[PDB]
């Protein structure tokens, strides 16, 4: 019954724009950080590995270093939002948001990138 949901499963963004991909999960009362794990992945590349409040950016894949972060202000709202800055062409593809918060679910999100003069 634990369900991750996405308001959008297709993002079409410009090269060089910023982009926030939303990933929603059920938060009944206060957020219990001790229970929450967030995994963002994109085709065998690890972007976010949030564990109970702790992250090692040493494990974020190099092509996302500096450019990708979890909006941790939104997790209290049950929104594990992935913000990507200075969008690149390589960022295009299928993203997975996986949330373990007691139960576990995931959702697939497609990003398509348009080159600057298309």
């Amino acid at each position: 019954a634990f369900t991750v949901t996405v308001p959008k499963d297709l993002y079409v963004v410009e090269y060089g724009s910023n982009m926030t991909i939303e990933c929603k999960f059920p938060v009944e009362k206060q957020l219990d950080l001790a229970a929450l794990i967030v995994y963002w992945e994109m085709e065998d590349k690890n972007i976010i590995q949030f564990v109970h409040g702790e992250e090692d950016l040493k494990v974020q894949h190099s092509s996302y270093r500096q450019r990708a972060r979890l909006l941790k202000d939104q997790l209290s709202l049950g929104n594990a939002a992935l913000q990507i800055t200075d969008v690149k062409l390589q960022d295009a593809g299928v993203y997975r948001c996986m949330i373990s918060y007691g139960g576990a679910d995931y959702k697939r999100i497609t990003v398509k990138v348009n080159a600057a003069y298309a």
Binding site: I37, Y39, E41, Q49, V51, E55, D56, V59, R96
Partner: peptide
């Protein structure tokens, strides 16, 4: 999975 520290892979998983 779920060592923060280690690298994961799909689905939870340590590739």
């Amino acid at each position: 999975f779920a060592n923060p520290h280690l690298s994961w892979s799909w689905x939870x998983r340590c590739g």
